[PDB]
């Protein structure tokens, strides 16, 4: 057994981190490997993760974080049986991947505009609450060439598009992803889509 | 009823003051009375984050800055439209509130903006007249003030 590429991890900055790594040869991740992780701190407890196969020689491990702050630093130990293969560190605040928004709904209140609203994926108790800027993606079901990405740079999770920039009689679909500039995060996965057919 | 204004002076309305549990714990004199309406202090007589007693109060929760100035507008993209402004106090202490509407709107719609972010409209109707105005608040990383500043001078965009 040998480590091909080094384990890289991402965090949602709330509860779950995820780590991926490729192996030398094909391996049964659940049978051969164990991943120990623990928060470097006075009061902390060690945790063990069972890897899942993602491919032939690619293992993935879901990590459990009760609470994450920016200073938190975790020690990762990759074990094959009783012989260490790889050791490393992981600061979740430096590898954040936010949770996707949801509760995406279409409001036809105003006749001059079309209101889109979604739910901020984090509770107000989370540090990422007032740092999430979103990006709404709208596309036409009839004209695939109509594929727009609006950038929402204010704190509220809503979007008002001019009703004149939409065409009458065709149905559009929308989805929204989120990112936090303050923490230099990657993008969240696209939310599930909503559909509407305006006339 | 004291209020600090953009880290410049203070206005109290309806004496002597001293800094509680810190250096320079001598009672001073109101150099400039207000008509007796109240008192006023200079920028050197103001030490934020110091237990200010005259009636005791915290100073960083009583700051009211100036309204923003130099409001600009320019399209960041084919559909984007970014609004800029300038502030007198430290830009890393202010929480801005942007408010806009059209000439057909019967009510203002507003969105909040962080200090590190810049406001922008992702979608704009080119055949409508827009009007923007911004006010700021000294909150929440440098203080816990609940009062905003005055609305800046409005800016306009578009035709029809």
């Amino acid at each position, epitope marked *: 057994f040998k480590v091909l590429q080094e384990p890289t991890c991402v965090s949602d900055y709330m509860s779950i981190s995820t780590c991926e790594w490729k192996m030398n040869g094909p391996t049964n991740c659940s049978t051969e490997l164990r991943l120990l992780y623990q928060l470097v701190f006075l009061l902390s407890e060690a945790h063990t993760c069972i890897p899942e196969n993602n491919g032939g020689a690619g293992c993935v491990c879901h990590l459990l974080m009760d609470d994450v702050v920016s200073a938190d630093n975790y020690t990762l130990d990759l074990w094959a049986g009783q012989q260490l293969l790889w050791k490393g560190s992981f600061k979740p605040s430096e590898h954040v991947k936010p949770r996707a928004p949801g509760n995406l709904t279409v409001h036809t209140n105003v006749s001059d505009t079309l209101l889109l609203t979604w739910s901020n994926p984090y509770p107000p108790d989370n540090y990422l609450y007032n740092h999430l800027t979103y990006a709404v993606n709208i596309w036409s079901e009839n004209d*695939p060439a109509d594929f727009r990405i609006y950038n929402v740079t204010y704190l509220e999770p809503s979007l008002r598009i001019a009703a*004149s920039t939409l*065409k009458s009689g065709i149905s559009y679909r929308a989805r929204v992803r989120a990112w936090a500039q303050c923490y230099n995060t990657t993008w969240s996965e696209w939310s599930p889509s909503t559909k509407w057919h305006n006339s | 009823q004291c209020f600090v204004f953009n880290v410049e002076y203070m206005n109290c309305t309806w004496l002597h003051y001293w800094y509680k549990n810190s250096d320079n714990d001598k009672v001073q004199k109101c150099s400039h009375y207000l008509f007796t309406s109240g008192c006023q202090l200079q920028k050197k007589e103001i030490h934020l984050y110091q237990t200010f007693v005259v009636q005791m109060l915290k100073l960083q929760n009583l700051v009211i800055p100036w309204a923003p100035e130099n409001l600009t507008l320019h399209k960041l993209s*084919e559909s984007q439209l970014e609004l800029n402004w300038n502030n007198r106090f430290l830009n890393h202490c202010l929480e801005h509130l942007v408010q806009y509407r059209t000439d057909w709107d019967h009510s203002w719609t507003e969105q909040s903006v962080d200090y590190r972010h810049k406001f922008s409209l992702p979608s704009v109707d*080119g055949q409508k007249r827009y009007t923007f105005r911004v006010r700021s608040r000294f909150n929440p990383l440098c203080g816990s003030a609940q009062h905003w500043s005055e609305w800046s001078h409005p800016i306009h965009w578009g035709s029809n």
Partner: antibody
Amino acid sequence: QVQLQQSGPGLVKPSQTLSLTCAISGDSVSSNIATWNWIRQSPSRGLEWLGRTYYRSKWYNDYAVSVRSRISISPDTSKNQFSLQLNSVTPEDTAIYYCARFSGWLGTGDCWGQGTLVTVSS
Amino acid sequence: DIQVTQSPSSLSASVGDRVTITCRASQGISTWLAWYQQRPGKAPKLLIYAASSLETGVPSRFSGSGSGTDFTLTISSLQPEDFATYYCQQSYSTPWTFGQGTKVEIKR
């Protein structure tokens, strides 16, 4: 910033095939927010739209009726290019040919190529 | 097929005048109309999209108005560099159809 470089002008014998290419800088041919078009201009035709190719979840092609029976527009994601081909050309196909980046959702040419004059003559 | 007819063929106006070019569509196309400028020897340049919105870097003296089938491009305070041919184009559906052009000549 986007920059579009076209192939050189030249001669094409009648009933042969016209082929032009467009080199894209500052954008991707496989961009899903844009569409890549070919337009020709001449007195007998005016400003005539030929067709477009664009990528969303797969490649799409759209042509004009006047040239659909003779036209083919193809992307080149290794050299970041796209090309136009017209076969069975007549002297009526003599014109100035532009490539252009049209915005996908509002169908408008943001960026155009300098233009290539193709002459059809024996 | 959305057809588009532009008028007039040509016009001469002095520096500072208010030039107006019109464009009539075959069907209702809401506000999906664009305006281009072609200076001599150069490719067309986008001026106005979505009937009324100025492309960045285009001087503020260019105006677009109209909705439905009748649209209008307006140049206030005509300038010597505004000498070109102006094309409209419906952006509603493919195939894109352009106007016949309008040669704006400067009168000095």
